[PDB]
Enzyme design. Structure first.
Site, PDB file in Angstrom:
ATOM      1  N   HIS A   9      -7.871 -27.552 -47.448  1.00  0.00           N
ATOM      2  CA  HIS A   9      -9.109 -28.250 -47.398  1.00  0.00           C
ATOM      3  C   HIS A   9      -9.409 -29.048 -46.114  1.00  0.00           C
ATOM      4  CE1 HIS A   9     -11.830 -31.664 -48.250  1.00  0.00           C
ATOM      5  NE2 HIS A   9     -12.320 -30.913 -49.262  1.00  0.00           N
ATOM      6  N   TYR A  10      -8.600 -29.421 -45.568  1.00  0.00           N
ATOM      7  CA  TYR A  10      -8.736 -30.311 -44.264  1.00  0.00           C
ATOM      8  C   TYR A  10      -8.882 -29.157 -42.991  1.00  0.00           C
ATOM      9  CZ  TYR A  10      -8.155 -34.813 -46.272  1.00  0.00           C
ATOM     10  OH  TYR A  10      -8.593 -35.891 -47.105  1.00  0.00           O
TER      11      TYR A  10
END
EC number: 4.2.2.8
Length: 659
Positions: free
Chosen positions: A270-271
Site C-alpha cells: 500500500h505505502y
C-alpha cells in the site's frame, strides 16, 4: 473583513496583480482583494494534472459525503461510520457546535487524523459543480472557518491530529483544487479569499518549518504537497521556497527510500504504491508547468523496478471481472480494487514507461480488458532487500502464484512494535491457485490507538496468525530475513532464514515440485526449549468448505467449483494438530471475518532441532483420494543441507539442497 495578512503573504509585484497592488497602495483593501479574486478567477499561468474541470461528475458515495456534512455535522471519515450500510458518518456535533476533538468509542488514532483531512470537502466541491447549489460552498466556508478558528497551529512543530504533517499535506493537495472548484461562486467573497489564502500559506510554511523527522511515506507526502503549493500558487512570496524545498526533498527521497530491488523501505505494498504515486505526480506537475529542471534527468529511474514490484504483487484474478481482492495483504497493507490498479496505478506506470510491454499488459488486461503487450516469463522473482520471493507457473487466471515474505528491518522500518508497519511474520506466504487465494494474509483490521485498547491491533500482528514457525506462538523479536539459496529448473527452490529469536532461527525451504505443488521444509534451529508451532491460516469458507483433517495433521477444501487443495504436515518428532479460529480483515475498519486455522505442535528440547515437512497439493475436484506421505532421508539437521522424500499419488520425489 479582508484579512490584511493576505497582502503580506502575496507578492503584489507578481505579473497580473497590477490592479491588486494599485488598490492596496491606495488603502483600498476591499477592492485590492476583489482584484485578487478576479485574478484567481481568470489566471491561466498554472496547470494541475490532478484536476480537470471539464465535465465534472460525482459518484453516489461522494454525493453522500457532500450531503451528510449538511446535517448534524456528520463529517465523512474513511473507515468510520455510524451506519456502514447507509455510509452514515458519526456526528461530531456537541452542544450545537462542532467538536473537533470528537472520536467514537472504539476508534483508533485514524479517526482523529482523518477528520482533520476534511475528506468531505472535495465531495462538496464536486456536488457544487454538478448541482450549482450554493449550500455546498456555504457549508465548506462555514465548516472550514470553524476549523481554522478552533485548531491553531502549534508553535513548536507537529501535533498528532490537526497539525500532523500528513494532515497538513493532505489539506494542501485538496485546497489547490477547492480554490478552482469554488472560486466563481458569489459566496467566494474577496474577504473569504483573503482568509483562504492566508491559511493556505500557514499550511505550506508549516511544512517548510517542520520536515517530518522519521522520513518514510509522510516525508514524501509532505514534499509532494510543498511542490504542489509552490508550483500552483506561485503568487505567494514564499512559493518559490515551498516548491524548491518540495522538489529537493523528492529528488533525495526517491533515492533514499527505494531499495535496490525496487521496493519501498517500509515493505508495505500500500505505502509502496503511495510513494510511487507521490513521485509520479510531482514529476507530472513539474512537467506541466515548465519546471522539469527542478528534478534530476534520471528522476523516474528508481520507479521502474518499483512499478515492476506492483506487477508481481498483482494476482491473476485481476485479469477477470470481479469484486474480490486481487493483491496480497502482507504487513500494514490491505485490499485493493481492480479499478484502482487498472485506472490509476498501472495507468501511471504505462505513462512513465511507455516502452514496457509488460506494464502495458497489466493495464490493458486488467478487469477483463482487451490485452495488449505481454507478460514476463514464469521465472521466480526475488526481492532481496524487502524480503519477498514470488514463485509462479504463469500469469493467467488458471495459474499458481506463491508469494513468501521474509522481511528485513531498515532505517525507515526499524521496529516490530505495535505501531510499526512491519509485522513480525517472517516466513509467511500467500497462495493463489486457479482463481482462489488459499492462504490470504490475516491483514491489518486496525491501526494503533494511543493510550487505548490495542487488542485487535495486536491480534492481527500475531506470528501464529501467519503461516510460519514460532515458539509458544510468541512474536519474533528481530526481522533480519536472509535469502540463502535459489535454484531454477523443473523443481524450483528458494531457501531462506530469519534469526527471529536469539536462540531460535527459522529456516524455510520451499520446493515448487515440477512447478505443480509445494513442499515446505521447516527447521527451528538453536537451543530454545519449548513448544514449536507451525501455523496455517486458510481461505474463508463455510465449515463444510474448509475441513480439518486433524487425524492427518492438515486440512482440505471442498468447494463446489472443484478448485481445491489438500495440506499435510510431517515431522521429526511426535506432533499435535491444533485447530483454531483465525480471522481476515480486508480493510482498516475494525471488521473481520473468521476463517479456519491450525498449528502443528511439537515439543523441542534444547539439544534438538525442530523439523517439519509440509506438502501443499492443488487438486482438481475431490481431495478424498489424494495420497501424501513424506519423511526426512538425511541423518538430521545440518547447517549446510537438508534432504527429504515426498510421495504424492504413487510418485516419489527426492528433494534435497546443499548450501
Amino acid at each position: 473583513v479582508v484579512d490584511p495578512q493576505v497582502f503580506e503573504a502575496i507578492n503584489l509585484n507578481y505579473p497580473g496583480l497590477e490592479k491588486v497592488k494599485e488598490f492596496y497602495e491606495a488603502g483600498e483593501h476591499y477592492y485590492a482583494a476583489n482584484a485578487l479574486l478576479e485574478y484567481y478567477r481568470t489566471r491561466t499561468n498554472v496547470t494541475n494534472p490532478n484536476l480537470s474541470l471539464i465535465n465534472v461528475t460525482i459518484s453516489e458515495a461522494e454525493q453522500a459525503k457532500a450531503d451528510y456534512a449538511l446535517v448534524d455535522y456528520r463529517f465523512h471519515v474513511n473507515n468510520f461510520y455510524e451506519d456502514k450500510e447507509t455510509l452514515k458518518p458519526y456526528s461530531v456535533k456537541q452542544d450545537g457546535g462542532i467538536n473537533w476533538e470528537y472520536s467514537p468509542k472504539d476508534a483508533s488514532d485514524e479517526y482523529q487524523k482523518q477528520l482533520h483531512r476534511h475528506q468531505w470537502f472535495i465531495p462538496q466541491a464536486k456536488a457544487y459543480r454538478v448541482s450549482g447549489d450554493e449550500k455546498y460552498i456555504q457549508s465548506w466556508i462555514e465548516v472550514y472557518k470553524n476549523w481554522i478558528e478552533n485548531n491553531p497551529k502549534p508553535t513548536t512543530g507537529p501535533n498528532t491530529t490537526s497539525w500532523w504533517q500528513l494532515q497538513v499535506s493532505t489539506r494542501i493537495g485538496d485546497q489547490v483544487q477547492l480554490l478552482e472548484y469554488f472560486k466563481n461562486s458569489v459566496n467566494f467573497t474577496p474577504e473569504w479569499l483573503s482568509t483562504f489564502l492566508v491559511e493556505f500559506a500557514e499550511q505550506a510554511d508549516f511544512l517548510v518549518d517542520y520536515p517530518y523527522e522519521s522520513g518514510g511515506n509522510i516525508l514524501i507526502s509532505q514534499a509532494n504537497a510543498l511542490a504542489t503549493a509552490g508550483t500552483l500558487m506561485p503568487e505567494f512570496k514564499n512559493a518559490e521556497k515551498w516548491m524548491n524545498t518540495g522538489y529537493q526533498i523528492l529528488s533525495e527521497e526517491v533515492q533514499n527510500q527505494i531499495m535496490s530491488d525496487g521496493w519501498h523501505k517500509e515493505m508495505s505494498l500500500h505505502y509502496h504504491i503511495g510513494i510511487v504515486a507521490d513521485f509520479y505526480e510531482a514529476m507530472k506537475l513539474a512537467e506541466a508547468n515548465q519546471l522539469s529542471s527542478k528534478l534530476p534527468s534520471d528522476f523516474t529511474e528508481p520507479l521502474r523496478k518499483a512499478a515492476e514490484v506492483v506487477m508481481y504483487f498483482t494476482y491473476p484474478n485481476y485479469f477477470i471481472k470481479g469484486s474480490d481482492n486481487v493483491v496480497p495483504m502482507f504487513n500494514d497493507s490491505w485490499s485493493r480494487t481492480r479499478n484502482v490498479l487498472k485506472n490509476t496505478n498501472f495507468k501511471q506506470y504505462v505513462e512513465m514507461f511507455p516502452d514496457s510491454e509488460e506494464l502495458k499488459y497489466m493495464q490493458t488486461a486488467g478487469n477483463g480488458g482487451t490485452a495488449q503487450g505481454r507478460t514476463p516469463n514464469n521465472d521466480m522473482k526475488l526481492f532481496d532487500q524487502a524480503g519477498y520471493y514470488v514463485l509462479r507457473n504463469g500469469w493467467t487466471p488458471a495459474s499458481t502464484v506463491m508469494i513468501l515474505s521474509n522481511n528485513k528491518s531498515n532505517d525507515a522500518s526499524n521496529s516490530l512494535s505495535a505501531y510499526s508497519h512491519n509485522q513480525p511474520d517472517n516466513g509467511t506466504f500467500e497462495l493463489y491457485h486457479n482463481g482462489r487465494n488459499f492462504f490470504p494474509d490475516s491483514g491489518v483490521c486496525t491501526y494503533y490507538t494511543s493510550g487505548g485498547d490495542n487488542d485487535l491491533r495486536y491480534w492481527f500482528r500475531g506470528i501464529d496468525k501467519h503461516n510460519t514457525l514460532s515458539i509458544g506462538k510468541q512474536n519474533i523479536k528481530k526481522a533480519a530475513g536472509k535469502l540463502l539459496k535459489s535454484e531454477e529448473g523443473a523443481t524450483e527452490l528458494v531457501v531462506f532464514e530469519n534469526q527471529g529469536y536469539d536462540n531460535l532461527k527459522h529456516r524455510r525451504a520451499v520446493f515448487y515440485v515440477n512447478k505443480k505443488f509445494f513442499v515446505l521444509v521447516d527447521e527451528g534451529i538453536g537451543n530454545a526449549e519449548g513448544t514449536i508451532n507451525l501455523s496455517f491460516n486458510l481461505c474463508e469458507g463455510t465449515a463444510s468448505e474448509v475441513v480439518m483433517d486433524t487425524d492427518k495433521n492438515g486440512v482440505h477444501t471442498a468447494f463446489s467449483n472443484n478448485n481445491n487443495i489438500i495440506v499435510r504436515t510431517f515431522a521429526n518428532k511426535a506432533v499435535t494438530c491444533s485447530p483454531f479460529t483465525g480471522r481476515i480483515a480486508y480493510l482498516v475498519d475494525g471488521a473481520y471475518n473468521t476463517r479456519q486455522s491450525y498449528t502443528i505442535d511439537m515439543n523441542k528440547s534444547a539439544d534438538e532441532t525442530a523439523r517439519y515437512i509440509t506438502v501443499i497439493l492443488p487438486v482438481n475436484g475431490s481431495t478424498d483420494t489424494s495420497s501424501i506421505s513424506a519423511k526426512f532421508i538425511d541423518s538430521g539437521y545440518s547447517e549446510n543441507s537438508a534432504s527429504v522424500e515426498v510421495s504424492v499419488n504413487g510418485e516419489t520425489h527426492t528433494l534435497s539442497y546443499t548450501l
